[PDB]
Design a protein around this ligand. Structure first.
Ligand SMILES: [Ca+2]
Ligand SMILES: [Cl-]
Ligand SMILES: [Cl-]
Length: 294
């Protein structure tokens, strides 16, 4: 069902001298849910219950997000993809995930998860993905109506929009969810970002890192690498397509539809589809995991 309550209990662990927060419920092989910008483990709260008893259910809060520590001193050079990956790699190592992991990914969680899967392919049992960065983008691949805003994030205007005015949390987020969010739901999304200034830096560093028209080159190369790999990998896949969808449409979707050994369903949603169709998404993930784990 829908609902504003988080799933399970937040746990904390020290990583590179910082505390990171995560949900870790149940036993067995992990089903690892990764949020992106500007969300947290909270994104998965109505989806994870569908996988009850099917494995160890894990959702990590990226550094500087959710209940994870902020980086200090924060600034325009902090919270790059590379820095997030250092923290998340270390957290995932610390969690003792074993060698039959099912990844469930979204948004920046997909860049992180697809890249981790490429690097740890022997340990990946299945990959479920939705509204994901399936390959590097060209501007034509970025949803037309949001181009100007994201171009502004990727300019000097970004600090005012995001650090001062919290545009990613307050405008982009509800703008890409089809149903109205409750007061409690927005409170949960707002909480890590209540203070103006550097507390909000992760939500600006993220759009600045999106691999678009060759920039930034490091993230482009990472996405190029995992795009080639996923297009050939026999690892079972679940593609949760969205209508109307947002990012994973057009050529982005044409491309991921070429990936081997893949099941697809379509659910209602734009970008943050977990808030529109959580039960349809959860049901599909659970069915996928049941087939992977007979
Ligand atoms: Ca909306
Ligand atoms: Cl095992
Ligand atoms: Cl972003």
């Amino acid at each position: 069902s829908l609902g504003a309550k988080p799933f399970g209990e937040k746990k904390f662990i020290e990583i590179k001298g910082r505390r990171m927060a995560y949900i870790d419920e149940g036993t067995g092989d992990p089903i690892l849910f990764q949020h992106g910008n500007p969300t947290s483990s909270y994104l998965w709260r109505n989806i994870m219950p569908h996988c009850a008893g099917l494995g160890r259910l894990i959702a990590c809060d990226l550094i500087g997000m959710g209940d994870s520590d902020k980086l200090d001193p924060s600034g325009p050079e902090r919270y790059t993809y590379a820095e997030h990956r250092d923290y998340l790699d270390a957290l995932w190592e610390a969690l003792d995930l074993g060698d039959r992991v099912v990844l469930v990914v979204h948004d920046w969680g997909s860049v992180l998860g697809f890249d981790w899967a490429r690097r740890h392919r022997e340990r990946v049992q299945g990959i479920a993905y939705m509204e994901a960065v399936t390959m590097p983008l060209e501007w034509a691949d970025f949803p037309e109506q949001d181009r100007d805003l994201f171009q502004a994030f990727r300019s000097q205007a970004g600090e005012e929009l995001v650090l001062q005015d919290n545009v990613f949390v307050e405008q982009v987020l509800p703008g890409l969810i089809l149903r109205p969010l409750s007061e409690a739901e927005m409170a949960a999304y707002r909480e890590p970002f209540l203070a103006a200034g550097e507390a909000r830096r992760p939500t600006l560093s993220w759009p600045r890192q999106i691999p678009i028209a060759g920039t930034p080159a490091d993230v482009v190369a990472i996405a190029r690498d995992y795009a080639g790999w996923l297009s050939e990998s026999p690892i079972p896949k679940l593609f949760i397509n969205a209508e109307p969808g947002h990012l994973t449409t057009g050529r982005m979707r044409d491309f991921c539809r070429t990936w081997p050994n893949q099941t697809e369903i379509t659910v209602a949603g734009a970008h943050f589809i977990q808030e529109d169709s959580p039960d349809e998404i959860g049901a599909a993930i659970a069915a996928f995991v049941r087939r992977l784990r007979p």
